[PDB]
Amino acid sequence: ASLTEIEHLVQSVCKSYRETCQLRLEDLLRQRSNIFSREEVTGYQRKSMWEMWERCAHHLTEAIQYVVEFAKRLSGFMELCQNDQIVLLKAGAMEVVLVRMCRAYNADNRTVFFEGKYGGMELFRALGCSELISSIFDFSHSLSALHFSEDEIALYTALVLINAHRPGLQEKRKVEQLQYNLELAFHHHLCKTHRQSILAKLPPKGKLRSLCSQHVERLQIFQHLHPIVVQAAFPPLYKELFSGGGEKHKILHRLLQDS
Ligand SMILES: O=C(Nc1ccc2c(c1)N(S(=O)(=O)c1cccc(C(F)(F)F)c1)CC2)c1c(F)cccc1Cl
């Protein structure tokens, strides 16, 4: 691809990320002063474990839906075969959601934007997921040091999703060409912006994958112990991405058609 085609792809990715942002950046930076009271934190702490899980699962599902829209606008993604579109989203949607969260994370007090206000790790104590919640906060703490620009997050989360190493891809070769054109665009943008030192500081690819495994493997421990709660109160999209007996409901293969 030519240099201007590469510049074209940078702008098309950045505009695609602008249009499918769940939260606006200027709103997140003005809410940093809006912090949960200690009594509000205590409210979240005394809530029942299964109620706190459903609450967070729905908020996670809503964020993943904006990632599907992001994929749907990605250059080349909708040109892939559907089975590869599902494989890429089944694996990378939570990863994109975990990277996008670092915008809603305040490194200057180790708080995160949750339900309109910012709060620390102790907000989620009722989940009984101390280690998983810590890994998420530390992951966001690392990305916040990079001081990503919105354009840089656009190209980074694009590559997080368009990955040719994903198990199950039927047309692995076409995803390779997609991944190459995007990393060339990402690298070209970092070169024009004088932000190439970011690449050496980026987290190793495994930490994102290990975070997902940490996340998913913890869910079905909850789904095994509290199975009826998951089938009745957890949202469908969440069960298809993350549950064993939840792939019967077809949800992704309709978000990818209704355009
Ligand atoms: O909550 C979970 N994962 C998740 C991943 C990304 C996002 C959301 C949720 N939400 S959110 O507004 O609720 C929000 C906003 C800041 C921080 C957090 C938290 F990750 F600390 F919970 C959550 C949107 C972005 C979850 C779960 F469903 C089951 C077990 C353990 C966990 Cl962690």
Author numbering: 265 to 523
Pull verbatim passages from the article behind this deposition.
RAR-Related Orphan Receptor C (RORγ, gene name RORC) is an orphan nuclear receptor (NR) that is widely expressed and is involved in regulation of various metabolic processes. RORγ is also a key player in the immune system where the lymphocyte specific isoform RORγt is a so-called ‘master regulator’ of the IL-17 producing T helper (Th17) cell subset. Structural and functional analysis has revealed that the RORγ ligand binding domain (RORγLBD) is comprised of 12 α-helices (H1-H12) and a β-sheet region (BSR) that responds to cholesterol biosynthetic pathway intermediates, hydroxysterols and sterol sulfates. The results presented here indicate that the RORγLBD requires a ligand to stabilize the active conformer and that hyperactivating ligands enhance coactivator affinities by allosterically driving electrostatic intramolecular interactions between H12 and H4.
After obtaining co-crystal structures of partial agonist SR19265 and antagonist SR19355, we attempted and failed to solve co-crystal structures of full agonist SR19547 bound to the RORγLBD. While most compounds protected H12, SR19269 and SR19355 exhibited little protection to this region. However, SR19355 and SR19269 also exhibit commensurate H4 protection showing that the observed H4 stability depends on H12 stability. Importantly, SR19355 displayed much higher performance in this assay with no commensurate increase in protection at these regions. This highlights an important limitation to the approach where differences in binding mode (an additional hydrogen bond in this case) can identify compounds as outliers.
